[PDB]
Enzyme design. Structure first.
Site, PDB file in Angstrom:
ATOM      1  CD  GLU A 109      55.123  27.713  91.240  1.00 48.99           C
ATOM      2  OE1 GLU A 109      54.413  27.087  92.073  1.00 48.99           O
ATOM      3  OE2 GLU A 109      55.562  27.197  90.176  1.00 48.99           O
TER       4      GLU A 109
ATOM      5  CD  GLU B 213      46.687  15.477  85.477  1.00 47.65           C
ATOM      6  OE1 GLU B 213      46.905  14.827  86.518  1.00 47.65           O
ATOM      7  OE2 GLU B 213      45.541  15.820  85.117  1.00 47.65           O
TER       8      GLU B 213
END
Ligand SMILES: CC(=O)N[C@@H]1[C@@H](O[C@@H]2O[C@H](CO)[C@H](O)[C@H](O)[C@H]2O)[C@H](O)[C@@H](CO)O[C@H]1O
Ligand code: NI
Ligand code: NI
Ligand code: NI
Length: 759
Positions: free
Chosen positions: A168, A271
């Site tokens: 990332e 989420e």
């Protein structure tokens, strides 16, 4: 010889090493014979062999004697894409594999054996991996990892047969310079370490987390931020209903494509709401019911539709999508596509066993294998033993709700497992501390993912550690830097053919100023300005994870603190990291006495601004506009790709030197002076000329009785020293007290400090 055969290596061999007659010894006469397409993969072995045999004559070649590497597609059925056969005979070594990956793993086994003994027993072994993805998640996110660290990490993974790293990170964007908040990575820098990974068979998968945790991308793009019913944005969440924002993400995907060679894209899909509620953003439900044609579409449906759209887009590029399992939510008018890999870490939502049963491919990104700088996980606190020694734990054991474990029975849909390296606070630990912290866990994960379990001859973790972890040194090519170029001492700091560097409150291009370098156990340096008595630091400016990320941020003076301790595992006693670690500096030998100076945790280089550098941080940050442009000659921190400024650090030339020491280290208020500490200051002539009329001026301090008058030394000859003493006694003051003495000789001036505790 290495006897028992293959009992001191990680991963352990997955079948038995069959012994044969005789042995083979590596010498400076051998060659690594390999086809040219394997040259880059063999280079590591070649370099290691020269290290091992203490010479430099070993080469990789298409012909020769010694170690032969053979790539034979005909072996694809027996060895798979990563299996190999290692054969040792009096005549030499033969590594056979069906593809490059397997042959390379073979060279890792061979190297680890030669790392222990130059003479190897004759015999043969076939070695095959149990799982196809043996992985690490590296969040080079918000905060930065130095390119040198990543290069070392690729070596660390490679030697253990780890073959997958999710990174990332921010790749410096060409099309969206307003979103290039640091951390970012140069495109050439990424191409470089992606190329090394290709040579070592490591799959580097990039991640741009979306549609949540996007603060690093949307801070300066309020129009792509999802807005309340009151219209308030939040850089954390991308408006998945906005067409230019979807275009923005998709452009980032494209930009990454030119430097990452992997077939995978990871969109994150943590989420979306991050704990909030979809009802606060009804335009998501309305977007959903428009794009599905169903009135009963929900916000979670829009989230899944976004997942699916990015899936089709990356699929159009021949790529395969990856998501975190907590992105798999309950839907109505949209169902999650099935050709997406699910990396399972959270024991919630659809169980991983039912996901596997439904055809999904799973990575066990297990929460037990987590590392964090902010709040250490159990594997850091206690080591891997609680897992190794747990027979109910293994690669096929995923996490379930309420602390339950779930064995995924359709094991063929389990790609493998990985450990995870998260920052959470970029200053609580340095990257070199992280590099020490994961040592045991990298070996443990490598073992259980290659072998499918623990080695048969290591019943307990203590055995695995004694016989393998403690016996297998890292590759001699792991380290890639001089960790302590300069010894601890007094130095000057300046530009090549320019003014020196001084610092009182702010830092500037001064002239005639001394510094004191103090090395640290994690291989950094403390730079103490010996005139101001304060240390060079970076604490002021725009931040992510308590770490300064503003480009052009201004180093400043800070109270010097203790930098002698390093912290890993539980980080017992780790306090003061907010001042300690911003005070630490990496010094990279730039040759000829020059040095690249990089902050240890902001990871930007000490530079002299030019007045011509441009970046978003110079104009605005997170919607609030303010100009921070450095002017020519201003001292600043800069990313590596915006500066070549190096620094000349050299031991000091000053002809005079003063040292002040008090006796005792503690002083107490006294009416007869018994608790009065006598500070002897002694001046030393360094160069070759008689110095005369040396004036020593004492400090003046609140709440202390100090001899008011200066002392003078008539003469000191070259290589000599002279001593004068002043007395200090506290009145109402208590605590630590620094005493600064000024020594003046002609045009030259220096200072000497002493510390006294007032009790
Ligand atoms: C999947 C997961 O583990 N998510 C949480 C992690 O969140 C990441 O945090 C980093 C910075 O620390 C980035 O912002 C990244 O986008 C996030 O996904 C979290 O870091 C760790 C625990 O520290 O695990 C989860 O809570
Ligand atoms: Ni042994
Ligand atoms: Ni979060
Ligand atoms: Ni070290």
């Amino acid at each position: 010889g290495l006897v028992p055969r293959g009992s001191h290596m990680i991963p352990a061999l997955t079948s038995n090493f069959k012994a044969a007659e005789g042995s083979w010894t590596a010498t400076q006469g051998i060659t690594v014979v390999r086809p040219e397409k394997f040259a880059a993969s063999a280079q590591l072995l070649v370099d290691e062999l020269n290290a091992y045999t203490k010479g430099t004559a070993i080469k990789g070649a298409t012909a020769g004697t010694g170690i032969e590497i053979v790539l034979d597609e005909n072996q694809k059925a027996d060895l798979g894409a990563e299996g190999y056969t290692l054969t040792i005979a009096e005549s030499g070594v033969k590594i056979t594999a069906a593809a490059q990956r397997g042959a390379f793993w073979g060279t890792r086994t061979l190297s680890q054996m030669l790392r222990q003994n130059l003479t190897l027993p004759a015999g043969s072994v076939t070695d095959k991996p149990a799982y196809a993805e043996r992985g690490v998640t590296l969040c080079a996110c918000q905060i930065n990892f130095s390119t040198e660290w990543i290069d070392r990490f690729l070596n660390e993974m490679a030697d253990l047969k780890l073959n997958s790293v999710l990174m990332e990170m921010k790749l410096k964007s060409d099309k969206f310079p307003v979103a290039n908040t640091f951390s970012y990575y140069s495109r050439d820098d990424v191409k470089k370490f992606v190329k090394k990974a290709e040579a070592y068979g490591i799959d580097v998968i990039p991640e741009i987390n979306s549609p949540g945790h996007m603060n690093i991308w949307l801070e300066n793009l309020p129009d792509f931020q999802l807005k309340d019913q009151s219209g308030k944005g939040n850089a954390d969440r991308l408006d998945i209903t906005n067409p230019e924002a979807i275009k923005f993400y998709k452009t980032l995907i494209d930009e990454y494509d030119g430097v990452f060679s992997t077939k995978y894209w990871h969109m994150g899909a943590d989420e979306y709401m991050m704990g909030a509620s979809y009802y606060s953003y009804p335009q998501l439900a309305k977007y959903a019911q428009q794009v599905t044609g169903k009135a009963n579409a929900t916000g979670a449906d829009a989230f899944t539709y976004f997942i699916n759209d990015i899936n089709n887009y990356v699929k159009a590029k021949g790529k395969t999508l990856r998501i975190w399992n907590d992105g798999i939510v309950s839907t109505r008018a949209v169902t999650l596509d099935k050709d997406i890999v699910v990396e399972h870490w959270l024991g919630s939502g659809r169980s991983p066993n039912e996901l596997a049963n439904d055809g999904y491919k799973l990575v066990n990104a297990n929460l037990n294998l987590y590392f964090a700088r902010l709040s250490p996980y159990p594997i850091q606190k206690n080591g891997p033993a609680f897992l190794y020694n747990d027979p109910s734990f293994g690669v096929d054991v995923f996490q379930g709700p309420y602390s339950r474990s779930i064995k995924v029975k359709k094991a063929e849909n389990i790609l493998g497992a990985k450990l995870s390296i998260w920052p959470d606070n970029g200053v609580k630990q340095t990257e070199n501390e992280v590099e020490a912290d994961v040592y045991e866990a990298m070996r443990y994960v490598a073992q259980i993912t290659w072998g499918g379990g623990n080695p048969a001859d290591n019943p307990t973790y203590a055995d695995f550690k004694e016989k393998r972890v403690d016996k297998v040194k890292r590759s001699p090519m792991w380290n890639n830097i001089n960790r302590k170029p300069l010894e601890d001492g007094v130095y000057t700091i300046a530009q090549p053919d320019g003014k020196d560097l001084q610092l009182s409150g702010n830092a500037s291009l001064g002239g005639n100023d001394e510094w004191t370098l103090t090395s640290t156990p994690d291989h950094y340096y403390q730079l103490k300005n010996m005139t101001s008595n304060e240390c060079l630091s970076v604490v002021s400016g725009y931040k992510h994870l308590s770490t300064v990320t503003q480009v052009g941020a201004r180093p400043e003076a800070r109270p010097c603190v203790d930098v002698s301790q390093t912290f890993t595992g539980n980080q017992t006693g780790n306090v003061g990291y907010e001042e300690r670690n911003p005070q630490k500096w990496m010094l990279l030998d730039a040759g000829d006495g020059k040095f690249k100076v990089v902050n240890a945790v902001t990871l930007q280089r000490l530079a002299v601004a030019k007045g011509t550098e441009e970046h978003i941080d110079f104009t605005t940050f997170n919607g609030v506009a303010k100009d921070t442009k450095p002017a020519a000659g201003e001292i600043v921190q800069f990313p590596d790709d915006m500066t070549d400024d190096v620094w000349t650090i050299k031991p000091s030339t000053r002809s005079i030197s003063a040292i002040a020491e008090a006796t005792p280290k503690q002083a107490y208020a006294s009416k007869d002076g018994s608790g009065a500490s006598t500070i002897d200051v002694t001046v030393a002539n360094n160069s070759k000329e008689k110095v005369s009329n040396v004036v020593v001026t004492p400090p003046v301090k609140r709440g202390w009785h100090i001899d008011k008058e200066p002392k003078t030394i008539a003469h000191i000859a070259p290589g000599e020293s002279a001593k004068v003493s002043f007395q200090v006694s506290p009145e109402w003051y208590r605590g630590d007290a620094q005493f600064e003495f000024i020594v003046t000789a002609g045009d030259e001036v220096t200072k000497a400090s002493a510390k006294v505790k007032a009790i």
